[PDB]
């Protein structure tokens, strides 16, 4: 498949990006200096300079120099194009209004210029990849600007985004409920399907599945990088049942306003513990449908699955996949909504996951990534909305947003839009 474009906005997105491109360079054998030295389809994410060099096709953006400064001084400094590392002067300070109205407006024009140039060199553009934090100043306000600009300027193209959905129990900021809803209202229409991941859920995986007692954001991004790699494996390798970028939205978006699938990955085992497990297709296939293995704290058993995409990767046999999927569908504890008799979208690629040196993930020749648009996320939305209205009833932090060029009316409109989204899940969750 042809080119796919990547965008990294905010500290979470930027830090995820360097982990994602660490895998991409390792998978294709590209050195950290931008020269290939160990699969010719790497042009999907890289542009050849014409002099034995490859420039990653990403646009790292932030309103502060700190996070991008690390990239400029890191090992991958020579990799990225200098102009792609667009940076501002002052951070959004966790305020949505700043990243969307005041400071975001000053730097949005420069971002589009680079994005336009990236498109000019495209013989074919499947879509965009946008990495951001669902709750945060730059990752919620500036992303909405790009979504509006990209949709109107380009349109008719897939727009995939990865979001750090706020964990129900764990939270590292105070005004996240305000920030998450504001971006959801503005990004719901211009998005195609946003993959959601929690920090708490990955921590639990790193503690139960993996034997790591000292995890860090660096570990999480490395465990999130393979999620992105598997999703784009078809565009970069060959295998039966190829899944193009645009196929994800068609299969996983029954309705325009329900495009928030969750992410699961398997196997996830340490080097020592791998010796004691066969890791056959049924084992990993069953693991993907375990509450203990999903990367979103919402309980899958609390709702019903509407659509599921199984991107099998490695030395897998299609017959085993069909038998394994049949076993899942006959389970009574698992339940799929009646109006969708067929929910599984299988994808097989002949490229086992690459081993990241120094990582906490063991070498496996057979891995699978599951994307499931499940109604269980409706409970998470209600809890997030419950936090918002409780704060907004007293104007806990509204004055900061008001002074940054955002009218108080948007809070009411945004929550009502969220309320309708809750009703939409309720409507599709029952059948006669």
């Amino acid at each position: 498949m042809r080119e796919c474009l990547s965008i990294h906005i905010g500290q979470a997105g930027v830090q995820m990006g360097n982990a994602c491109w660490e895998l991409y360079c390792l998978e294709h054998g590209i050195q950290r200096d931008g020269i290939v030295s160990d699969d010719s389809s790497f042009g999907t994410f890289f542009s050849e300079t014409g002099s034995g060099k490859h420039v990653p096709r990403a646009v790292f953006v932030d309103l502060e120099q700190t996070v991008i400064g690390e990239v400029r001084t890191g090992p991958y400094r020579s990799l990225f194009h200098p102009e792609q590392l667009i940076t501002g002067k002052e951070d959004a300070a966790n305020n949505y209004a700043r990243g969307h109205y005041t400071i975001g407006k000053e730097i949005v024009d420069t971002v589009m210029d680079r994005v336009r140039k990236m498109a000019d060199q495209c013989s074919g553009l499947q879509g965009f990849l946008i990495f951001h934090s669902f709750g945060g100043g730059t990752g919620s306000g500036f992303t909405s600007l790009l979504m509006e600009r990209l949709s109107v300027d380009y349109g008719k193209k897939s727009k995939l985004e990865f979001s750090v959905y706020p964990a129900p129990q764990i939270s590292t900021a105070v005004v996240e409920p305000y920030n998450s809803i504001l971006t959801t209202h503005t990004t719901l229409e211009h998005s195609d399907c946003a993959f959601m991941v929690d920090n708490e859920a990955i921590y639990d995986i790193c503690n139960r599945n993996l034997d790591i007692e000292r995890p860090t954001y660096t570990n999480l991004n490395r465990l999130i990088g393979q999620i992105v790699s598997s999703i784009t494996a078809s565009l970069r390798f060959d295998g039966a049942l190829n899944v193009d970028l645009t196929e994800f939205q068609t299969n996983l978006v029954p309705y325009p306003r329900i495009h928030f699938p969750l992410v699961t990955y398997s196997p996830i085992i340490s080097a020592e513990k791998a010796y004691h497990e066969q890791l056959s297709v049924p084992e990993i296939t069953n693991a993907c449908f375990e509450y203990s293995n999903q990367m979103v704290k919402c309980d899958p058993r609390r709702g019903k699955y509407m659509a599921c995409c199984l991107l099998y990767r490695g030395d897998v046999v299609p017959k085993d996949v069909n038998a394994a999927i049949a076993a899942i569908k006959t389970r009574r504890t698992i339940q799929f909504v009646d109006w969708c008799p067929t929910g599984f979208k299988v994808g097989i690629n002949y490229q086992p996951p690459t081993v990241v040196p120094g990582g906490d993930l063991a070498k496996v020749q057979r891995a699978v990534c599951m994307l499931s648009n499940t109604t269980a996320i409706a409970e998470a939305w209600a809890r997030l909305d419950h936090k918002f209205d409780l704060m907004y009833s007293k104007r806990a932090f509204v004055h900061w947003y008001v002074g940054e060029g955002m009218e108080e009316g948007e809070f009411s409109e945004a929550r009502e839009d969220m309320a309708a989204l809750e009703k939409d899940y309720e409507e599709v969750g029952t059948e006669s």
């Binding site: 042809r2 013989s123 193009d244 046999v317 049949a326 599984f344």
Partner: protein
């Protein structure tokens, strides 16, 4: 000489095509580089059926490969027989279909269809007597379903007198591969139910069963299922290429197999299919092949034939053969399976024999069945299309591409008519 042009669209289309010319070239002894290395003059006597000779001791297969993304076709170029095809016939787009019938038919495929027909027209002009067309695709797929139907309508309009075969992979009943298969199949059947003369329905579920028990293959792959499919597809045209006591071409099968114009959906089969361990303990003779081919477990279709009846059956044999034995077993099947054939058709078997067998086998047979049991297949799709379309499960993707909701209901009704027409003729005069 009777001649055919092969068309392959979509991922399943091209891959089966690739595993089809890997077998046709083997029968005719054609080297992957295109040069002929066959050991018998009887192979070149009818090579022109599938190949257009290029001076220089090389032959080029007149085949047209269509795909909206280049991923599937790029792999074909890198295959053992990739360099065999003419580079000009490789026609592809840039924006692949998202498994939506609309994009592969109305928006994306509409721009590339003109390019495809031009190559097709040149191939037809390169022939002295064109007999028909062959299309390989998958109803659940978007490109094949959408682009395949668009091509069928255009060539049918351009060449109404010529036949056109279709080897379509049909969605399995238990485990699927695309979420929106019900929409793609119903839309595509709505076009194939009036444009094509004979269609062969294949499902991977049935092929998986064959490998598991009939062939005892522990780790099969699509590299193996396609080989089984290619065997049947090659068998259908054994007569156009090699001599035999009772020759049956594409048209002869169509007349003997298509009683009514809309009832042109068949379920293919093959025999013998035995594992390496079982090769010692079985005798390769006519009496054994007849049982295997009529066995419900050897069928390449999920629907059980015993749940229905056979309007018409066609047996294509290969290899050294005895006509009386062939006649005997078919008579035994007629008498033994008393209730498996309709009363309003006294004779249900169309027999064909060819002298040369396939590959190293000393005997082969191909089974074609126009059984009424296939109604349970459209009925299942009929229930899966209704349940989704009942509340517009995934319609907003098809609507956005231009398709109107009205076209959806017409195809559902045109699908219900097909099932009713199958149930109608399952009756008995007395």
């Amino acid at each position: 000489m009777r001649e055919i042009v092969h068309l392959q669209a979509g991922q399943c289309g091209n891959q089966i095509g690739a595993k089809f010319w890997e077998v046709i070239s083997d029968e005719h002894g054609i080297d992957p580089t295109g040069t002929y290395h066959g050991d018998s003059d009887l192979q070149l006597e009818r090579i022109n059926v599938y190949y257009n000779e290029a001076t220089g001791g090389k032959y080029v297969p007149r085949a047209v490969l269509v795909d909206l993304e280049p991923g599937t076709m790029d792999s074909v170029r890198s295959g053992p027989f990739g360099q065999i095809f003419r580079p000009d016939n490789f026609v592809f787009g840039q924006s692949g279909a998202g498994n939506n019938w609309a994009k592969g038919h109305y928006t994306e495929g509409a721009e590339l269809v003109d390019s495809v027909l031009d190559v097709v027209r040149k191939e037809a002009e390169s022939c002295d007597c064109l007999q028909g067309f062959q299309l390989t695709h998958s109803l659940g797929g978007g490109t094949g379903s959408g682009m395949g139907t668009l091509l069928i309508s255009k060539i049918r309009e351009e060449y109404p007198d010529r036949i056109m075969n279709t080897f379509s992979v049909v969605p399995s009943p238990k485990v699927s591969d695309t979420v929106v298969e019900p929409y793609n199949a119903t839309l595509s059947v709505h076009q194939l139910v009036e444009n094509t003369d004979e269609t062969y329905c294949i499902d991977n579920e049935a092929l998986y069963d064959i490998c598991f028990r009939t062939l005892k293959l522990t780790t099969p792959t699509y590299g193996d299922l396609n080989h089984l499919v290619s065997a049947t597809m090659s068998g259908v045209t054994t007569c156009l290429r090699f001599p035999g006591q009772l020759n049956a071409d594409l048209r002869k099968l169509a007349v003997n197999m298509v009683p009514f114009p809309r009832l042109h959906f068949f379920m293919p089969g093959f025999a013998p299919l035995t594992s390496r361990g079982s090769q010692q303990y079985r005798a390769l003779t006519v009496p054994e092949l007849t049982q295997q081919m009529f066995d419900a477990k050897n069928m390449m279709a999920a629907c059980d034939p015993r749940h229905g009846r056979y309007l018409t059956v066609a047996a294509v044999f290969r290899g050294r053969m005895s006509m009386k034995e062939v006649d005997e077993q078919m008579l035994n099947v007629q008498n033994k399976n008393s209730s498996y054939f309709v009363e309003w058709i006294p004779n249900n078997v169309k027999t064909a024999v060819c002298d040369i067998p396939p590959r190293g086998l000393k005997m082969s047979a191909t089974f074609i069945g126009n059984s009424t049991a296939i109604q349970e297949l459209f009925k299942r799709i009929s229930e899966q299309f209704t349940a989704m379309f009942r509340r517009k499960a995934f319609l907003h993707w098809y609507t956005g591409e231009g398709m109107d909701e009205m076209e959806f209901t017409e195809a559902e009704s045109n699908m219900n008519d097909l099932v009713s027409e199958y149930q109608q003729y399952q009756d008995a005069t007395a």
